[PDB]
Design a protein around this ligand. Structure first.
Ligand SMILES: [Ca+2]
Ligand SMILES: [Ca+2]
Ligand SMILES: [Ca+2]
Ligand SMILES: [Ca+2]
Length: 333
């Protein structure tokens, strides 16, 4: 058996997992059927292992959180774990036992090993006592820029013979912030990217956040718009508005309609000297969004053009503290 969970313990098999989130896998090292086993010395000496072939393109193991526990919840001594970057890089002994167990891995994998096959056998195997491996891994930050499926595969090796235990699939959504230039808050208004802005004209930078899909695996804790604008040409006026980009369903079942003014659910921080403004969603609001709802929002920063010339803007949308850059807009004065 294999299941993926979030930190709070919810089953998240098949769910959308944001870059930066952790997959708290629980792998059952299933020894129940061996109660009253009568296998030979040589079969026992063939050993007991658990193999997790994790998808290293997408995930990094969190080695400090990896645990092997018995049925009382106590850590198991005499079991160790090593993570290898490939079969080729693995010790010869490891290559050989995988071959014998008839296990194929792709790229990087972990091997959990019974240090002393005879002691492990006497204690857990012949007694039919199953163990639970907690094996947390984090989605690579950069993967959020392309997104896509990943799957975790595991194998159990009993008496040197291996077999597949389970596969769990998840998907990483692609987070793609967008930046437009407007002279209106109407979402249908013309984009002035690539066009002219008059000297001392006010206008908006429209910062459209990335889309968090429904069926996501954990709470949203951060959704921010960080705009380091070019203060040689642009001045932030101190005014902004933030709107929902989609219909949101809250944990209480209420619905916030697309286009609703959510400015009061945000805070703002300015650095005029360095020409930066940051707008962040409040936890009080983010914690109310259903895990089964999408989330997306957009901020209109009111600017003033304050010099002749050509000026660019880019903003960064952070989503649970992973940064994603928007396109770069350009206007001329
Ligand atoms: Ca290693
Ligand atoms: Ca792998
Ligand atoms: Ca829209
Ligand atoms: Ca700046």
């Amino acid at each position: 058996a294999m299941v993926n969970k979030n930190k709070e313990g919810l089953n998240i098999d098949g769910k959308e997992v944001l870059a930066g989130s952790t997959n708290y896998y629980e792998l059952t090292w299933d020894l129940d059927q061996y109660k009253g086993d009568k296998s030979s010395k040589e079969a026992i000496q063939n050993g007991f292992y658990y193999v997790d072939d994790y998808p290293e393109e997408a995930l990094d193991v969190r080695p400090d959180l990896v645990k092997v526990a018995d049925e009382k919840g106590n850590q198991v001594s005499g079991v160790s774990v090593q993570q290898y970057d490939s079969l080729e890089a693995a010790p010869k002994k490891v290559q050989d036992l995988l071959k014998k167990a008839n296990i194929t891995v792709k790229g990087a994998f972990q091997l959990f090993s019974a240090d002393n096959p005879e002691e492990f056998y006497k204690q857990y195997v012949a007694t039919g006592t199953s163990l639970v491996i907690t094996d947390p891994m984090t989605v690579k930050s950069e993967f959020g820029k392309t997104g896509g499926k990943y799957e975790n595969k595991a194998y159990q090796i009993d008496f040197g013979n291996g077999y597949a235990t389970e596969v769990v699939v998840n998907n990483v959504p692609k987070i793609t912030p967008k930046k437009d230039v407007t002279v209106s808050l109407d979402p249908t208004s013309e984009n002035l990217d690539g066009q002219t802005v008059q000297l001392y004209q006010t206008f908006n930078y429209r910062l459209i956040g990335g889309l968090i899909p429904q069926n996501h695996s954990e709470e949203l804790e951060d959704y921010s718009f960080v705009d380091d604008y070019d203060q040689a040409g642009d001045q932030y006026t101190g005014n902004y508005k933030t709107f929902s980009s989609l219909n949101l369903t809250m944990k209480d079942g209420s619905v916030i309609k697309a286009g609703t003014d959510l400015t009061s659910q945000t805070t703002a921080e300015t650095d005029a000297t360095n020409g930066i403004v940051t707008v962040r969603f409040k936890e009080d609001f983010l914690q109310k969004i259903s895990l089964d709802s999408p989330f997306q929002a957009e901020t209109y920063l009111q600017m003033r053009r304050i010099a002749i010339g050509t000026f660019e803007n880019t903003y960064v949308n952070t989503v649970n503290k992973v940064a994603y850059a928007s396109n770069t807009v350009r206007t001329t004065t």
